[PDB]
Amino acid sequence: TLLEEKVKLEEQLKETVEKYKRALADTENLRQRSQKLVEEAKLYGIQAFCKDLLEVADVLEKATQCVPKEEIKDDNPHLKNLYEGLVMTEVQIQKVFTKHGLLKLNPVGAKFDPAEHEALFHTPVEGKEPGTVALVSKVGYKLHGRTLRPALVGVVKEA
Amino acid sequence: TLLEEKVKLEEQLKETVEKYKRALADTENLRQRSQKLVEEAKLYGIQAFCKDLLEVADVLEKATQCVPKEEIKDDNPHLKNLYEGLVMTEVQIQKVFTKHGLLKLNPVGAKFDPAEHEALFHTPVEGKEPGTVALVSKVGYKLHGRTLRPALVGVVKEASA
């Protein structure tokens, strides 16, 4: 009777404390899963933003690089000022991109990398080692160490 | 002492049962709050990026508005191409903004409301209803109902008379 009461109380206490510990352990694992899910959602949103954002920088860079530096003179005050403003806006755009992890890709004279570079064409070049970039057609971008868009680049072939 | 020890043990059992129920309620609350946080981070999460690029968009708009619209001729063939490139870039950036919920606040003649508009001056304007926004110094932005940058307006003031 009373002797069995102590045994049953000890068993009930052990079961209740173990169930409490398991309930508390579920909260921590659920919290970690929630943090992972929130971070993954943030990453997906930022990636979706950057993928559409790259085209603005590409178009602006093409527009500014269209004009050569020979005719940018003080006798054309409406063109030198605009060119300077556009170059500074490009610098600002690149600064904001690299501030939020969006890294540019300008591998001039670097070793060819299939993951980070796209081989537009193969052409031997004198004085340059094969498999090394000789020119860059389009500048790619990298986000947090992953290639968001490979750079369309040329690879020196063997002559 | 055995009787009071067993009474204390039973009280501890009741307390730990109540605490177990509290833990179950807490994990249910965590489930609901996690769902809400995941949804919010799905919607937003481009807040810092957009709040940084607002100035690039403003600069591009100012560049489109600053060329005197008279020297874009065949006498200046290279200036015309640069202006066309700038216009295309501005249009593309405004197209990218609109896709991701960015809606420029341009209350030209709407009613002032502090939740979205930042007042810059209280100049009275004759012929305009009091409480409306006379002009928009800078077009603010907002995404999904969250005002990233307020539109810097000038609110009209009732006449002193």
Place this chain on the structure above:
Amino acid sequence: MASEAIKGAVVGIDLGTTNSCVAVMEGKQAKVLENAEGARTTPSVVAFTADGERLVGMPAKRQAVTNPNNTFYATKRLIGWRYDDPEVQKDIKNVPFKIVRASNGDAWVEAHGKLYSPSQIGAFVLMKMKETAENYLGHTAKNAVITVPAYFNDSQRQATKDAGQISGLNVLRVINEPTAAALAYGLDKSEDKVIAVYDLGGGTFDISILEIQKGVFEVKSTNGDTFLGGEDFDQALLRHIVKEFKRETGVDLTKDNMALQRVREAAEKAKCELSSSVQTDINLPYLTMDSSGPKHLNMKLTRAQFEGIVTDLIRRTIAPCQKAMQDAEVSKSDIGEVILVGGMTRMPKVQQTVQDLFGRAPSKAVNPDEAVAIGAAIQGGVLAGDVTDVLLTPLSLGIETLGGVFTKLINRNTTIPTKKSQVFSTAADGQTQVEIKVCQGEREMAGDNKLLGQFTLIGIPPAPRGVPQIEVTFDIDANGIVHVSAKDKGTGREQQIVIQSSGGLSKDDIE
């Protein structure tokens, strides 16, 4: 007196003089909650419209120009202060709104013929943070911990307690700002020591010398500069940039407003940049319009120039520290730790000055912007609430699949007495033998992590692939005893495996 049966969440509200903050103890670390507009800070401004409204926060700063005689900003300077006091007498001239005399001789504020005490303004701001905390929590919060500056009297502490109580919030305990900073920096679980708290960056500067004897913090001396803060650094940089631009071209942006705003924001960005980078540049295209055309600003700013601009301000943080050391009756060798709080305690010149003044390298293990709120949340969680129970895994376990994928049957951070079950199908059609391989690791490849054991389940009825179901149940029990078994409903023939000791070669193999 028995247990209080809190059954609620305690939030630590940092009721600041300009910018407030609310933080809660999510699990093992204090988490700062963000308000509706996504910011981590609610400005302490309360304004009332003509008919009736309670705009608090940014919607109260934004409309300040149209409502200049009703917006109450930085009312923490009038809490618990009698009307006939030197501080209120000096303050009344500057504030646009009318500070009036109350019946009980208290400095109150006025709005559209309705009397508000300085406690009620803080009560409204506390209501705002209560809403922004209930939004995150989901359920209402009743008990809270609110922090006050270390120089507050007992009357001001009572006033802040009343302000907390008015906003449907049973204030748990009123804490000191230096004590909350020490709690956030983690000096609560430390032996007897003497520390100093460097609070620079807000609207005011404050230095307080503490003491951690017997695990309880006792304030020894407090001092600081009334008219010094983090706004002066930004103003100095802004004025330098404006003067440099005017010298370079000839247009002053002081008469401008949009250009001034852009320059101010760029100055803030560069100042925050001139703490981990030696050199910075400021680009602001199309800053101003002139008859000659647009003008662009392009300044190259180095760390040395910035240090030389604000050297006087940092020099001004030297006499109060020495006076606080003198009044605390401890020399530069007694101080065993230095606590850095505030936004302006990040630039290396400030840290060098602090080290020179105290002789110790300052502790920068916690973001100084939100240390007070984090400490308040930690103290509120520890004092009342079942959080200390949760206060008290480099590898995981998996199985082998037909495709070789290292399926994660059990999680990594899981308690030992946990039982989980999973069902799996057969490999191919006509298969009669099912083999399960046990391994430990975190990479998604069974053979690339470890190789512990292998047991084969023999005997299943013939069936097309995908129809047979085999249930894998893990019965790890006690502590360190692992039970791995597979159950199938076809034939009553299972297999066992030991896997009692794993990961014996704990070395850089994972790395």
